[PDB]
Design a binder for these strands. Structure first.
Ligand SMILES: Nc1ncnc2c1ncn2[C@@H]1O[C@H](COP(=O)(O)OP(=O)(O)OP(O)(O)=S)[C@@H](O)[C@H]1O
Ligand SMILES: Nc1ncnc2c1ncn2[C@@H]1O[C@H](COP(=O)(O)OP(=O)(O)OP(O)(O)=S)[C@@H](O)[C@H]1O
Ligand SMILES: Nc1ncnc2c1ncn2[C@@H]1O[C@H](COP(=O)(O)OP(=O)(O)OP(O)(O)=S)[C@@H](O)[C@H]1O
Ligand SMILES: Nc1ncnc2c1ncn2[C@@H]1O[C@H](COP(=O)(O)OP(=O)(O)O)[C@@H](O)[C@H]1O
Ligand SMILES: Nc1ncnc2c1ncn2[C@@H]1O[C@H](COP(=O)(O)OP(=O)(O)O)[C@@H](O)[C@H]1O
Ligand SMILES: [Mg+2]
Lengths: 312, 312, 313, 309, 312, 312
DNA sequence: GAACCTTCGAGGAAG
DNA sequence: CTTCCTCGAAGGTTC
């Protein structure tokens, strides 16, 4: 499998790995579970993979679920009963869980017990459950999304960042070693430069280029071959997606560069507001294609020269 | 049947058709299942037809269902259990299935296994099931509405587009042969012009014109008879339909051509704004009948001269 | 009778009427049943009436039911067992159908057969029930809510439209001959003007004027009596009710045309929110007297010139 | 009895009353059933009373039920089977019937037949000629296809001072209480235009006259009783006067928001908006504005303050 | 007993008490049931207490229930029909009854009958159920929530008002004799002036001071003990709590008396916007310490002279 | 154990403790149940902990449940039937109960009875349930959500306050005994000054510092180790985060101390408009680093010296 | 003309 | 199916 299993295999995120190593080692001298950890940042950067590594280092099983998957208190109660001592519970998009369910975790995380009503009619009665020790791992896009009473109960916080070209190059070379394939260093660098700094995209592109090199080439990935393969896909010469081009083009042609609010833009491009906010705007801002102002977003001169317009 | 069964018979969609060929033959060389594929775009372009073509080229049994047909996780678990190695599962309107159902689809697509909670009260167990390799094929009219974590699982994407007159004329001819109807090469070109670029519409008109020529003619579809029949159907020589004319006419007469929002007073017509946004609006945009503006849609001079109103 | 029985008697709807006429003959020239037809349009335009005309002009027996009366797949089977070759099946409010039945309906429409369960427990078995050729006619007031697969099956589409003065005038004349009442053509036009384009409304107005004409007059509907009757009833020449007129006046006199919120307007006329939004407001929008905006309703220039008040931008 | 029995006894509603007389007399001349009638409008104006009058003029026996009592289609189908030719069915609070029942009523009204599934089989029942009468305060809640099948629509209006004065005098004779003509006018002004409110004040004044007087209502006893009840000569209550007073003396006539005004009088926000403001707006004492509500010149004159534009 | 039982013991409420006396006496001379009565107004002023007094003065048995207990028409139909001639039915929190249930009282209150369904299937029939004469009593804090047709059926309306210092002083002395406690008239007035006009608050203060007087004193309440106890509770001589004093001080010393917004004021005291607007601000306005204006809150001259500052 | 068990162990909250002591003793002398008490205030100050202490001082069994666990009236009625004379009932997060259930407590708290419907449903009647004497304890973070008639029934109100450095330092030392960690008195003061006056934050920081000193140290928290550990966690010596430091620096370097509007400032820091106002600005105002004004907010002299710039 | 504060109106989502 | 409530627009004042 492609997913790393141990910290020695996990490339990048040095600042996070440095802290997690110290807290995991200390928690292993003492015979007790690790404090609840919260990971936040852009999607697709590898925070789920981090949860598996933690479980393998602690030597316990990992269970996985998501906020939207829990709708009533009976769901969360049934899940917690299925945990063994020291197990790790991973909850994705924890910010999207219902408020009536969130207030059930408060007692579970802080004191390991839950008060519940059971039975029906004359049998209806309250019960006091006593849970075994466990570690919760939460995932969310931003810290300001969660309520103050919940955020205060997490003991560890991790912020994850985009990968740099030297890191993605090694990840691409690693992946191209599990597949019995050959890639030249110049090709690996070119393929990485197109991957928007995100490891998930890099794995998807490498698969498609591998197919093209088998049917349309000599079975080896080279700069001349990779250039054509990526040109056949919609990936621009600097990684911009077709959805990215739609946004930039709309701002210049229909809005004249702005200012425009992301809310109004979303309905004009027919994209869900949460996707443009969480997936597309973050990269476009951190790379100078879009600028933010008090009134709204504005396209920079770099965008005009890229899309082929005149920065009048 | 009318719909083609192999790539040799499938007309148009050259971009999509060329990509899938490379990936399909590469997947065979490796003797493995095809990656998950997402087909999206306007209705009636042949999205469903393409799913059958992939199944025949791979040589597998196709299974079919729709988003709204699945109501609880227990249903999808049964379907996923009823799969043979390599089977293709096609889900129409995937964007409409409930969030509670999508929970299971993530784990299946990512690792081919599912964990099902079972029991209630004192009964509280789960079972782990390993699925045989399969290929998921989804189809949607709305892409931007698809949940981001789901959209990231699809490895192959195809954007369907409107057919051009050379292709549509060839389709009109091919379809006429199955009806054993006699149509001249001139009359076949007339229907193509007014089909709005959608094969389903072209087939609808041809089926109706037959009944006209069998009474108002000598069973031969002549250009004059075809043109007289299309005017009887109220089909514009530009292919605008009853709903299309009703939109533009009200905008000009009641709002001086706009600008007006898509739902602002579309209540003054019967059509649900979702169909206007998904099936009527995109055609008019490509044909230059309407342009989008900061304040809504505005009728271009073409519409005025077409509808026969003096432009401002 | 009050309902027409043949295309000769069915006034108006020439576009849809002419199309159906051709398609029916082409089917009669062969041993084939008419294609499944879907009828669209606002309520009361004659959808139900058209179904009987189709059945009579086809020369076929009609079985009638409705969407609310069907609750489970077993109901359709019992009906399908009663149908006969070439019969027409009419289902009003087909959009009403419970989705569980909608899926099985596809096979009958497209394949003329359906699955049937027999036995119980270990003896449970599934078998096909074959069906003779038949034509389904579906009347629906809403189109975009029908599931896409169902819509793909329906072959012919027909849009019903509001009758215009030249045709609605003839319907009044025709109804005036079922009763023993004489009506002057000038009077018949005055009623048609106020019928909002709906045949059912024209008949209701005629019944009320008839009662007055035989109690407060000589039993004849002349232009003089028609004017007095339409004065007891407060229906404006545009067909605005007494309350409709009060709404417009209040907006212009007290708020300078608005914007004004729904709740504020309701308490001025002493009416419920739901009553204004559902009984009076809808027609005023169609005629273009008012518009809905983020800040509330606003009166248009057309409203000012009808009520007789000066207008200012 | 308090409820009038015939049109000659039914004071007011000249518009609705005149139309019904024409349609009822014409229907009799043809020996036909009366068209279906829907009565709607504000509370307490006479909707229920008018339904019984119609039955007495037609000379028929009235069947009575209510929306809340009909819970399932089987209930209505049973009631309909008991109808005889010319019978009148009256359904009060018709807006509460479940939609599963209203959809049955379409054909029963327009075609006089029902087709009900009932080993499952369909029985066709052909109903005799009958008239359905409905009364409701929320006519907008009825389905659009149901409203289209009623042939007569009666919209009720408020009453005038000369009509209410005669009602107060009539009711006083049933209580065998003596009341002077000018004393009756003083109650009519305070009745807000509603017959039920006029009767309620009369009952309270009768209690006062029997305990604090000689059991006779005169221009002197009435003024004392109305002073104890604290009802202004315009029909404003203690809380109504307190609202106007606060707006004029603390905010200079407004504009002021609903929340601020409610908190200043120690009232629940929903109670001020739904229980006091409606009458003040209809009488022209208050106006709603984009920035709040303001007291009009009529309010200054009534409360006794010098207006300043 | 802590709750008064007859009008001789019910202090205050002169307007409501005077009216009810006259209406009760007239009903007895006519020997008939009392008209329906609605009691409404602010919390804790004596609405529930007055309902029992009416029953003792009328000399009849009282049946008691509440809105939250009546959840379906079958319940109400079972409470009715069990009434005997002249009974009094008291429903507390009547505003909670479902609106579909309220509409059953319409004919019961006006005509003393209800329409019920009887029999089954083809034997089903509707019959009138006739009720004996009865008096309905309702109490609510949210009168505006009742339907217009229901409020119009109540024949007597009682709106409660706040008490005055002479009456509250007498109430404290009465309660001080139920418990074994001696209290000086000077001390009784000292508590009354701090009770915000509400009898329940006066009783609460007395209970708290009693605990101190028998633990830190000789078991007697006197001016010396009362002043010390009220200093521990930290209740200003105007009835202002510790948080109330902090609000006024902040407005005078930092903002020069205002205008200031609610958000800015809430953040400076570490409170939250909803508690300040719902718990504390209401009484400060009703007593004239704060004034609300289009620009913000402003402190009045009355506040300056209370806190000891100069109204410069 | 972490949670103090008795008033001798509960450090701080002198004002709350002093009152509770007097009221608890007076109740015991009379041999009566304690009056209903409501605890409210900011998160993590000790509300839950105090509820258990009160139960130990009274010497009675504690019955525990939570607001979100009570879904309907039948649940609450079942709990009340399980009470015994003198029992204490504790409802945490009492603000989450639905209004239809909250109005059942009105009669229970004042008169110890409840109206209930009983019977076969063919025949049924209302009946009183009579409750034994009991003390209801409620805890909530926002009292403003409780209806006015409920709050008026609580006889004892406890408002919690933030801890001072002298008291907060002792809590840090106490916790070091449980973890068996030697801590220098100087190091205890450093952690206390960075804990924002909140005990939960202080305990969280101590656990992180403890893990660091035992993995790369000799198992002693000295003044030198603490500085290194706190630098890794990135907690300023005033408890400010990098975001808080970024805010203050931007106002000083780009605006000369302001005034600046919230919208303009948010853009210059790449933060969300509403997040900054709800998350970070509250603590900056309370400490006096920022001051709000009618024209914007201004950095005070205290913020200048902390950042090292020269004030003018 | 940048920044704060209040009030209203129409959606939508939590029972 | 209904209540509750929250997001967006705009009128008005001050430096
Ligand atoms: N073209 C027509 N000529 C004469 N009478 C007509 C015509 N169209 C409709 N009517 C009459 O109008 C009345 C109502 O017609 P329907 O067909 O029942 O309306 P509808 O579409 O069924 O209304 P619904 O079912 O409530 S949506 C009947 O009395 C018909 O006889
Ligand atoms: N014209 C009238 N003359 C005399 N009494 C009248 C008149 N109209 C109404 N009343 C009396 O007013 C009271 C209320 O009349 P109703 O008919 O019950 O009002 P309503 O329309 O039923 O109000 P609802 O049902 O609550 S919406 C009864 O006592 C009637 O006798
Ligand atoms: N006039 C009075 N004289 C003596 N005690 C009084 C008086 N009015 C009220 N009380 C006491 O005040 C307390 C509260 O009165 P209640 O009648 O319960 O208030 P309330 O109207 O029921 O408040 P709710 O129900 O929460 S809105 C009781 O202990 C009464 O005995
Ligand atoms: N540091 C890394 N080294 C190797 N592979 C990685 C790394 N980070 C991510 N990946 C790969 O990219 C994908 C990341 O998926 P996942 O961890 O689920 O991202 P997320 O959890 O953010 O959705 C996986 O296929 C994973 O193997
Ligand atoms: N390229 C094509 N060649 C032949 N027939 C086509 C083609 N595209 C569409 N059609 C025909 O038009 C219809 C398309 O329907 P379908 O594939 O269901 O559209 P969609 O799935 O996009 O709604 C079918 O009847 C099919 O035979
Ligand atoms: Mg009470």
């Amino acid at each position: 499998t492609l997913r790393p299993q141990y910290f020695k295999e996990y490339i990048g995120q040095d600042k996070v790995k440095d802290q997690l190593k110290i807290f995991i080692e200390a928690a292993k001298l003492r015979d007790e579970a690790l404090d609840h950890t919260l990971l936040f940042g852009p999607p697709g950067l590898g925070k789920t993979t981090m949860a598996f590594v933690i479980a393998n280092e602690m030597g316990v099983n990992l269970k996985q679920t998501s906020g939207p998957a829990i709708e009533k208190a009976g769901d969360l109660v049934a899940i917690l009963n299925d945990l063994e001592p020291g197990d790790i519970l991973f909850i994705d998009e924890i910010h999207r869980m219902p408020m009536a369910v969130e207030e059930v975790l408060y007692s579970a995380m802080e004191d390991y017990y839950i008060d519940i009503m059971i039975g029906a009619g004359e049998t209806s009665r309250s019960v006091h459950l006593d849970l075994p020790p466990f570690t919760l791992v939460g995932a969310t896009t931003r810290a300001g999304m969660l309520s103050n009473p919940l955020r205060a109960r997490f003991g560890i916080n991790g912020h994850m960042e985009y990968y740099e070209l030297p890191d993605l190059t090694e990840i691409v070379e690693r992946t191209s070693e599990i597949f019995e394939m050959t890639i030249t260093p110049e090709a690996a660098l070119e393929l990485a430069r197109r991957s928007r700094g995100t490891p998930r995209i890099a794995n998807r592109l490498l698969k498609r280029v591998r197919d093209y090199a088998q049917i349309m080439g000599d079975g080896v990935i080279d700069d001349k071959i990779a250039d054509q393969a990526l040109t056949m896909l919609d990936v621009d010469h600097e990684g911009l997606d077709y959805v990215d081009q739609k946004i930039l083009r709309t701002m210049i042609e229909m809005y004249g560069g702005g200012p425009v609010g992301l809310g109004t833009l979303s309905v004009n491009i027919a994209e869900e507001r949460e996707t443009v906010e969480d997936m597309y705007e973050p990269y476009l801002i951190q790379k100078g294609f879009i600028m933010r102002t008090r009134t709204g977003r504005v396209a920079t001169a770099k965008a005009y020269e890229h899309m082929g317009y005149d920065y009048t």
